[PDB]
Amino acid sequence: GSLTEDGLSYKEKFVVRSYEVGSNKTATVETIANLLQEVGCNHAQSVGFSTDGFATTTTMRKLHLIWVTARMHIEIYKYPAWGDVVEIETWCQSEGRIGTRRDWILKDSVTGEVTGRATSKWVMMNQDTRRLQKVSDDVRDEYLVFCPQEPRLAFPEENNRSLKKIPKLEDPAQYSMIGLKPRRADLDMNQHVNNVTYIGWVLESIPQEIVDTHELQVITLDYRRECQQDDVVDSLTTTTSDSQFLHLLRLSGDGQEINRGTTLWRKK
Amino acid sequence: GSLTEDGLSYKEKFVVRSYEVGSNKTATVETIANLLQEVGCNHAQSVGFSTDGFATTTTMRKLHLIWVTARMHIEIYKYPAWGDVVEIETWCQSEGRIGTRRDWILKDSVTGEVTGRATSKWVMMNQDTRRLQKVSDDVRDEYLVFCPQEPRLAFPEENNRSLKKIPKLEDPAQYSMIGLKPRRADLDMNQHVNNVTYIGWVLESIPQEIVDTHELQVITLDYRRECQQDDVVDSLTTTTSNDSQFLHLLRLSGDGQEINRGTTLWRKK
Numbered sequence: 001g002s003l004t005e006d007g008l009s010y011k012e013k014f015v016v017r018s019y020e021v022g023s024n025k026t027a028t029v030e031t032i033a034n035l036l037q038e039v040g041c042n043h044a045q046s047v048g049f050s051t052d053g054f055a056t057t058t059t060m061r062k063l064h065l066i067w068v069t070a071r072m073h074i075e076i077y078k079y080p081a082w083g084d085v086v087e088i089e090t091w092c093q094s095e096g097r098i099g100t101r102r103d104w105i106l107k108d109s110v111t112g113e114v115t116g117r118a119t120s121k122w123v124m125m126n127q128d129t130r131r132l133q134k135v136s137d138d139v140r141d142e143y144l145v146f147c148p149q150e151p152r153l154a155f156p157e158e159n160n161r162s163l164k165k166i167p168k169l170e171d172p173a174q175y176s177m178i179g180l181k182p183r184r185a186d187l188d189m190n191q192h193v194n195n196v197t198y199i200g201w202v203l204e205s206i207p208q209e210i211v212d213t214h215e216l217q218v219i220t221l222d223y224r225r226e227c228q229q230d231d232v233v234d235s236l237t238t239t240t241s242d243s244q245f246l247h248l249l250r251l252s253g254d255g256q257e258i259n260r261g262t263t264l265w266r267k268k
Numbered sequence: 269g270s271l272t273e274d275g276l277s278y279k280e281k282f283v284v285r286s287y288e289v290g291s292n293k294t295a296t297v298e299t300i301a302n303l304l305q306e307v308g309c310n311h312a313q314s315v316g317f318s319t320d321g322f323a324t325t326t327t328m329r330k331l332h333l334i335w336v337t338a339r340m341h342i343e344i345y346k347y348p349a350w351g352d353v354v355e356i357e358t359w360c361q362s363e364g365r366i367g368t369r370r371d372w373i374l375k376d377s378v379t380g381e382v383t384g385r386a387t388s389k390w391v392m393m394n395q396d397t398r399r400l401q402k403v404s405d406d407v408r409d410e411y412l413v414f415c416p417q418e419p420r421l422a423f424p425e426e427n428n429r430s431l432k433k434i435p436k437l438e439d440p441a442q443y444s445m446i447g448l449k450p451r452r453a454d455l456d457m458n459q460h461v462n463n464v465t466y467i468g469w470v471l472e473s474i475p476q477e478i479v480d481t482h483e484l485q486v487i488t489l490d491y492r493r494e495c496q497q498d499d500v501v502d503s504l505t506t507t508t509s510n511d512s513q514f515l516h517l518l519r520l521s522g523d524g525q526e527i528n529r530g531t532t533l534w535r536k537k
């Protein structure tokens with residue numbers, strides 16, 4: 001992988017592995033989300049971010065700050081087959097004092113055709129108190145260094161899906177998968193649950209018949225609170241409709257919301 | 269990746285990813301086991317095996333046969349760091365009518381030093397009845413075409429660890445992790461639980477303090493029966509021992525049917 005000519009974006013090629021694919025021998029949406037995180041990390045390292053797993057700037061380290069995910073939105077047109085090479089291009093953008101965005105474009109290396117796109121929103125948080133905050137003027141100046149200064153959006157369309165408000169699922173849910181717990185493979189190098197695990201947990205309450213007859217087209221996931229290493233999660237799903245679903249992840253005990261989201265599926 | 273000059277082994281290089289590493293920023297043993305499976309699959313494809321996820325020969329497809337894992341044994345000297353390149357060499361051998369073996373050597377691409385080694389034993393099974401069987405004359409002939417004919421072993425030593433008998437853990441276990449269930453990410457393209465998931469489940473009952481202060485050196489895992497997509501597993505561990513040694517048992521949480529047994533050896537960091 002490498003920064004592009006202008007140094008304002010990063011590209012990397014990946015060969016889809018045997019264990020990364022589902023029953024149709026194409027990459028799972030979790031494999032895709034893992035690849036987006038990997039190219040995101042390689043980009044951060046190439047533009048001088050910390051190498052501890054937190055990907056922080058020098059101002060952030062001094063102020064005890066870290067970025068946390070607020071939302072992930074992915075739209076796939078074609079999932080790459082086992083053995084195929086997929087090229088992913090990524091870049092970041094400052095969104096005033098609200099937070100930052102990381103965008104991605106996926107392409108078929110052989111054809112050059114766009115096969116998918118993704119966007120993520122990140123908010124600043126104090127690492128110690130776990131309190132959210134606004135982006136300071138010094139952090140906005142650090143992002144000007146490596147981000148395009150004119151807008152560059154993976155999802156440009158006004159009023160598009162990636163920015164839509166997600167409602168809260170009302171009990172009773174149509175479908176559910178209860179007592180989901182993370183194991184060591186679900187944790188990152190800092191012992192926090194990997195963001196991709198929550199996508200897997202959302203998908204667990206989708207009936208196997210939908211997965212067998214449909215392809216996932218779009219997934220939008222809001223992140224509200226973290227699942228700790230010793231927490232247990234319930235995954236809830238209700239059909240709102242193509243097939244469309246509304247999702248809710250909450251802690252099994254007290255029912256505290258951890259995530260909410262929606263999925264859009266197309267009949268194969 | 270590619271077959272070596274003689275066409276009797278296969279090599280591939282891997283760059284260790286951000287999500288593949290643990291707290292010490294080196295690859296987990298599950299990442300290593302995933303890489304061994306991946307280079308194994310690329311070798312099978314290069315020597316003309318099926319491309320359906322079962323990796324079968326022509327004779328096996330005609331006879332409705334598949335290979336199943338009987339044992340996995342891995343010894344790591346150094347786990348590669350995040351961003352490091354690891355080169356893995358793999359080859360197979362026919363073991364008469366008993367079954368077949370796949371061996372692996374891991375090396376640091378920069379230094380060329382051996383950082384780990386692994387061996388696996390596979391037994392023939394009828395895909396329909398799920399009954400184990402011996403390897404037929406025709407399957408042994410298919411293996412002669414791509415396997416070295418003189419013995420080549422990752423673990424050559426006399427009565428080495430890789431072939432040791434593993435006893436059954438007696439209740440009560442010292443440690444346990446109850447109610448483990450596979451999710452879709454744990455399944456392979458054929459909707460069976462991935463062999464690496466069982467390594468993860470064995471390790472779940474090791475206390476976090478051992479993981480925080482020790483490095484896993486050797487893991488030996490026997491495979492007896494499969495965990496189905498709707499099964500639930502309990503993971504049991506008892507200390508048997510500068511080094512820490514454990515005995516492991518995975519069983520179905522309902523009836524207590526054994527699915528795996530194994531041992532781990534750990535060294536204080």
Ligand SMILES: Cc1cc(N2CCNCC2)nc(C)n1
Nearest residue numbers: 068069070130223224225226
């Ligand atoms: C993952 C996450 C956590 C979080 N916090 C954590 C606890 N303090 C307030 C809320 N906020 C967001 C947007 N995402």
Ligand SMILES: Cc1cc(N2CCNCC2)nc(C)n1
Nearest residue numbers: 336337338398491492493494
């Ligand atoms: C060695 C072995 C045997 C096996 N059996 C054999 C009896 N019928 C069910 C399948 N399954 C596995 C995963 N490994």
